[PDB]
Amino acid sequence: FGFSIVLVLGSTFVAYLPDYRMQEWARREAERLVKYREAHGLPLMESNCFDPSKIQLPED
C-alpha cells in the first residue's frame, strides 16, 4: 500500500487525465481558426484585440 496501489496507480492516473489546463482543445481550436483565417483572406492574428471603435480616449 505504498507502491503497488499508490505509486503505480498514481502513475496511471496522472499518465492520462483530461487535457490538463485545456491543451488538446487549444490545438484543435487553433487548427480550425487558422484554416478559417487563411481561407477567408483575413490577416492571421489581427492586432488590436479590442476594436478601437469601442473606445473614447481622453483628448486635449
Binding site: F1, G2, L7, G10, V14, P18, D19, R21
Partner: protein
C-alpha cells in the same frame, strides 16, 4: 476539499483508540489511503481555479504543494522511528497526533481563500512545530533554537496582519478573486511603500532572505527528522506559496521599491553557497542549501514573468523533495554513528554498499542533474532574470559552480576514501532506510517524466 479535511480529523483519534504495537500499521496504512484520495484532487482545467465551500479553492499553485504535503505526511510518519521507539506510549501517541494536527493546519493554510484565514492557519502551522523540535530535539541548544524560531517568525509576520486588516476595511472583502478582478493600482506615496514593505518583509522573514537567515540552520540541526523535514520543505515552500498569492496587489510600485532585495538576495546566495563549502556538521549543509534555493526563489518572485513563476513553483517542489530526502540520509548516518560531526564517519562506500546509490542520486538531484526538476526550475529562473537584466548571469553561474562544488564535497568527503577502522558498530542498512530512499526518489523521477502537471497557474 472538505472530503480531504474531515478524514484527517478522523485520523487523529486513530492513534488514541488503537492499542500498543498496533498503532504503527494503522497510521501508515490510513495516511497512505489519504494520499491516494489526495492525488484524486487533480481536476484543474483551463479557465478558472476550482472553487467551492466558499472558503476553499485550488489553483495549480496549490494542487501540487497540497499533494506534496499529503504525500510527505506518511513518509515522515514512517521515517520518525528508531529514535522514539524506546520512549513511552503516551509521548509516542502524542508525537504522532501532534504531527497529524500539524498536517491539518497545513492543508487549511494551502486552501485558504481569505487571507486572514491564511494568516491564522499560518501561525497555526507555526505553533506545533516548536513543541516537536523542543521536546525531541536530542541536542542541547534546541531550546534557544525554538526561542529564536518563534520570535523571528512571529515578529516578522506580525504587522502583516495589520496591513491585511487595513486592506480588508479600505477596499472590501479578501476573496482572492475579489482581491483580483477589483484591484486598483496603488500609487507611490510613502504609506504604500510601508504597506508593501510590511507584507514583503513578513514573507522575507519566512523564506528566509539572507539578512534574517540564522533563524533556520540552528532550528534545522537541532530538530528531529520529522520536524526537520516538515520545517524545511513544507514551511519554506509555504512561505513562497503565500508570497505568490499576495503579490497580485501593489503591482505598479514594486518595480520602483523592489530593487534592494534583489541585491541582498543574490549576494546572499553567493555567500550562503560559500559558507556551506567549509563547515563541519553534515546536517548544516542541507540547511544552507535550502537558503541558497530560497534566495533564488525570492529573485524569481520579485521579477514578474510567467517563466519566472513556473520556474519558481518547480524549484519549490523539487527542492522540498531533495532537501527532505537528504535530511533523511543525514539522520541515517547519525543513527549509525552518534556523532553529528562530519569527518568522523568517513568511508561508507564499502560498508552500507547500496547506500552509496542513494547518496549519489540525492546529490545529483541537488547538482541539477540534466533532466531533473531542480535543473528545470533553476534554468527558467536564470532565463527570466537574464531578460530582467543582461548582467545577472555571472552571479547565477557562480552559484551553479559553487553549488556543484559543495554537493561534490559532501559526496566525496563524507562517503569516500577510507573507513576509519576504529568504529565497529555500523550495521548493514535496514529495509526501512532503503524504503524511504525509494519513497523519496520515485516521485521525483516520475515528475521528471511528465512535469507539466506541476508548473504554475501562469501556464
Amino acid at each position: 476539499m472538505l472530503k480531504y479535511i474531515i478524514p484527517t480529523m478522523m485520523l487523529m483519534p486513530l492513534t488514541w483508540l488503537s492499542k500498543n504495537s498496533m498503532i504503527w500499521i494503522n497510521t501508515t496504512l490510513h495516511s497512505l489511503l489519504i494520499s491516494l484520495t489526495s492525488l484524486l484532487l487533480l481536476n484543474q482545467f483551463g479557465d478558472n481555479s476550482l472553487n467551492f465551500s466558499l472558503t476553499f479553492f485550488s489553483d495549480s499553485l496549490s494542487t501540487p504543494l497540497l499533494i506534496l504535503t499529503m504525500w510527505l505526511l506518511p513518509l515522515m510518519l514512517m521515517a520518525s522511528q528508531h529514535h522514539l521507539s524506546k520512549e513511552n506510549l503516551a509521548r509516542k501517541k502524542l508525537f504522532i497526533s501532534m504531527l497529524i494536527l500539524l498536517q491539518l493546519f497545513l492543508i487549511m493554510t494551502f486552501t485558504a481563500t481569505e487571507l486572514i484565514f491564511f494568516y491564522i492557519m499560518f501561525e497555526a502551522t507555526l505553533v506545533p512545530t516548536l513543541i516537536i523540535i523542543t521536546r525531541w530535539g536530542n541536542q542541547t541548544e534546541r531550546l534557544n533554537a525554538g526561542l529564536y524560531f518563534l520570535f523571528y517568525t512571529l515578529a516578522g509576520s506580525l504587522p502583516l496582519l495589520v496591513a491585511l486588516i487595513y486592506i480588508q476595511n479600505t477596499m472590501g472583502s479578501l476573496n482572492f478573486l475579489i482581491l483580483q478582478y477589483w484591484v486598483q493600482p496603488m500609487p507611490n506615496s510613502w504609506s504604500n511603500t510601508f504597506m508593501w514593505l510590511a507584507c514583503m518583509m513578513a514573507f522575507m522573514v519566512k523564506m528566509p532572505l539572507y539578512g534574517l537567515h540564522l533563524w533556520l540552520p540552528k532550528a534545522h540541526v537541532e530538530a528531529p527528522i520529522a520536524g526537520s523535514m516538515v520545517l524545511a520543505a513544507i514551511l519554506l515552500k509555504l512561505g513562497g506559496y503565500g508570497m505568490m498569492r499576495i503579490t497580485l496587489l501593489l503591482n505598479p510600485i514594486t518595480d520602483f521599491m523592489a530593487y534592494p532585495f534583489i541585491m541582498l538576495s543574490l549576494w546572499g546566495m553567493i555567500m550562503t553557497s560559500s559558507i556551506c563549502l567549509r563547515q563541519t556538521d553534515l546536517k548544516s549543509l542541507i540547511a544552507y542549501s535550502s537558503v541558497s534555493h530560497m534566495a533564488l526563489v525570492i529573485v524569481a518572485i520579485l521579477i514578474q514573468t510567467p517563466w519566472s513563476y513556473m520556474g519558481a513553483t518547480a524549484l519549490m517542489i523539487a527542492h522540498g523533495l531533495t532537501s527532505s530526502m537528504l535530511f533523511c540520509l543525514a539522520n541515517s548516518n547519525y543513527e549509525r554513528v552518534h556523532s553529528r560531526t562530519m569527518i568522523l564517519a568517513r568511508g561508507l562506500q564499502t560498508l552500507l554498499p547500496l547506500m552509496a546509490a542513494w547518496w549519489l542520486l540525492a546529490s545529483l538531484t541537488n547538482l541539477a542533474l540534466p533532466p531533473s526538476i531542480n535543473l528545470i526550475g533553476e534554468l527558467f529562473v536564470v532565463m527570466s532574470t537574464f531578460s530582467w537584466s543582461n548582467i545577472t548571469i555571472i552571479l547565477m553561474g557562480l552559484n551553479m559552480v559553487i553549488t556543484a562544488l559543495y554537493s561534490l564535497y559532501m559526496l566525496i568527503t563524507t562517503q569516500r576514501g577510507k573507513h576509519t577502522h576504529h568504529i565497529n558498530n555500523i550495521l548493514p542498512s535496514f529495509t526501512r532506510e532503503n524504503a524511504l530512499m525509494s519513497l523519496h526518489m520515485l516521485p521525483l523521477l516520475l515528475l521528471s517524466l511528465n512535469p507539466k502537471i506541476i508548473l504554475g497557474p501562469l501556464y
